[model samples]
Target: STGVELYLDLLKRTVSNFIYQDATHVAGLITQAAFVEEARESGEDYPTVAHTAIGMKRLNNLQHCVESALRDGVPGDVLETGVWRGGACIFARGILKAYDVRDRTVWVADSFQGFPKITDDDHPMDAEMNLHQYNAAVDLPTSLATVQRNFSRYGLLDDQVRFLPGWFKDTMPTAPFERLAVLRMDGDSYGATMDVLTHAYPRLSPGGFAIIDDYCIPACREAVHEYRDRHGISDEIVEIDRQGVYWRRS
Candidate 1:
């Protein structure tokens, strides 16, 4: 109970810092805060600011999980699909460095061209339109370039930070990689999540972790459920509050 309480306390602080940090600290947080303000002005119930804060929290937990797993002898690669600004992947790389895991690679996947057309039947129409507008305003390519620059600022080179710039459907299945120890899916739509699961699940190492960043939302949950059922995989899924879901590969 004490450990849980401590974690919660730290989480609160992390969220606060993530929200109010100066632009030089972690630029992603700055962009996320702007989005949040925009969402508030738009009168959307789902505050982008709050959602981004939650995402940063989940990312902190994800970093700890990856570090713990690596320390416990889980060998393989780590990856994040739908990396908006590379915050999560950068955190993973920092953990690998801290643990002295020299051979590990951190792969980041994103279209760097904005959200794809919403083709998933389960996608919420209003949310989809809102995101479309956001992408048009934000410029995904410039955002990803900023992410790359951030990595460079942290002294992470391109070699250790692999970037696959394309849609998950077009790039994931055929992407040449192996032994995925951690797979973080932040695709916000049912179709996008399903595409990653269908294409990337087999590459997951036994005992590796899969984190679905949108699973707390209904449409994402439905997509994951349907995909799991079709595959007949009986793995237990763990929900991480309103942020996401995770399950270890068996």
Candidate 2:
């Protein structure tokens, strides 16, 4: 029915701020045009008004993955590591609502304080990228309360939506979730990416999808490939908007 489709479409537009064309970062800098450009391309800009920065294509890919898992009877909950603002995870919950599937949970994990400090020895590319520099300028340290408010704004906040607030290295290792039907990673750094993959990948059920939102970043790409190759994961990596990629577990 168009009811579900229409609602989700509007949710995507609102979360991405595509319709509003919100400013990125400070008001004068990163104009509406620049923000929209980034949103359409790969959502590189940190939006002042939008909950997510992953743009429309990546969100569409996420929708496809979640819907496919539901239709195919893939069993397990959905999770997103490094859920800044919780847009993607909110959409996952919305999908579950649309399908009236109330059993599975949607886990949102993040430091809430933005990316952890990087060391060259542990993550050379991350140290080179120095994404932490944007923390203050762009408000990268999105808080858990803000994220919950974002979820509630969409009427998607509930027991089904869970938040893990802490650094990935400290939180993911002993996280209690048993299985995941969809594992979305957006940590954007080598150490963060590797941490999520190392601790969460094993919990992903067979035939589940793994969406990598930072494949365009050198550090994140390096981490993804290293983990995949080391584990002999040969699933075809499908490119999404030239920035993100995904592959289903065999």
Candidate 3:
């Protein structure tokens, strides 16, 4: 009986893998390939320029996570700090729309005036880095406007996206929002990450997720460690690729 059970498990694993491989290939051809081709034809490298472009690949996974949480009867808000070109927020809004989730707002936070000045703690060697290197060149107002335009382009400008312009310190504490269920932090620096976690962690809902975009970087990781230690929160931290990190609330 044990041997038969093991064989069945292996068979199930193989079938699941085959199904996923076929489905992924089909999705790539239909969506990813088309997007890349269009961008190339238009003389634009969409993948390199849009944070949301790269993030869209993670949509399937994110959708699963969000739906699973919802099934568990969780209710709260969503947020994304460091929205560039508003791709991720647009994706989030689409998901909300598909699920008919009303009254759940998605906040988009950014400095909008290019990257803020890198502080001693934010930089590895206390040397200011170039803003252009991080794909940030638009100023605050322009970036905000661009994001709004992108949302409008996607027909998501109804009321879900709440734009929080300026630096995290200036915007987060005064943000007129509540109950964060999903917090995606793509701040790209120690100072920005610290500011967001310090100011906003208290508002996170139980079972909510804090996705840190720069957590794999040395400075950002160190800053998160310091902050979590200071706060006495011992949640397990997850690192994804060289840029993503996440921890769940409660």
Candidate 4:
């Protein structure tokens, strides 16, 4: 048990590159010569080497939810939507191994090519942000092979890890899974956020968790609230960090 805990700790550090203590990348420049601790903690910087932009707090929240579900005997698999470089999903798979849970799968959902074009119909805030146009500048595309490679790096790639490669609107609504214990979203836009929440929330087991990785952004925050209101979801949202929040399904 201690070995698993230690391994997960080291894994998070390595995936977040906290072990490397990498400098923050700002506007195509290394803004800090030394490691900017705040940047890594808040996930504000475009990391030079980290597989995840979620930072430590959000990752810890994910680990907590997954572990809790297993301990509580919650029925379902685990999933992370909008995976970037697959760090968070990889971490989920690591948890399953550490807990020796073979019945559940870690669903890795993403549009490996990054953000899709958004218009007013999707959400005005997202369209205004124009994040889709900056994919190249931000290095948003993580090919499917690259994601699998990252998983193999930790030797966690196996049948239990399922990849769902496509836009949320196209793939999530028809996902074959019957239930989920953890539904973590990092879609970062109103439309993408709503898409996952609308399609996946129903499958979340009671007492399971719904973690939003970009709660700090207005677009994401609004979508979360809108979804909650529309669905009569009264779960109290607990802040994980300045950038993320989660609530257990009631």
Tens digit per residue, CA lDDT, model 4, 142-210: 899999999999999999999999999899999989999999999998888999999998999998999
Off by over 4 Å in 3: 1-53, 119-142
Q: Using lDDT as the measure, name the better of candidate 3 and candidate 4.
A: 4
lDDT of 3 by residue, 163-223 (tens): 8988898899978987888888777667778889888878888888887766655657777
Please list the C-alpha lDDT of all candidates, in the order they appear.
0.65, 0.86, 0.62, 0.87
Model 1 residue 134 distance off true place after TM-score fit, in angstroms: 3.3
Worst 10 contiguous positions by lDDT, candidate 1:
42-51
Please estimate how well model 4 matches the true structure, expressed as its whole-model Cα lDDT: 0.87
> Which has the better TM-score: candidate 3, or candidate 4?
4
Which stretches of model 1 miss by more than 4 angstroms? Answer: 1-56, 119-130, 137-144
TM-score against native, each model: 0.75, 0.93, 0.73, 0.94
Kindly indicate the candidate among 2 and 4 with the higher TM-score: 4
Give the total clashing residue pairs for model 1: 1
Q: Write the per-residue lDDT of candidate 1 for residues 56-158, one digit (tens) a residue.
A: 4465558656866786677788888887656567667766765567887898888877677554543574355445445644333436677788677556655
- What is the lDDT, from 0 to 100, of the residue 250 in candidate 2? 94
Model 1 scores a C-alpha lDDT of: 0.65
lDDT minimum window of 10 residues, candidate 4: 24-33
1-250 in candidate 2: lDDT tens per residue?
4999999998888888888787777532355435556544476677777888888889899999999889888889998998888887888898899889989999999999987766655666788877787678777788999999999998899999888889888999898899899999998888889999999999999989999998988889999999999999999999988679999999
Clashing pairs in 1: 36-49
TM-score leaderboard ranking? 4, 2, 1, 3
Count steric clashes of candidate 2.
0
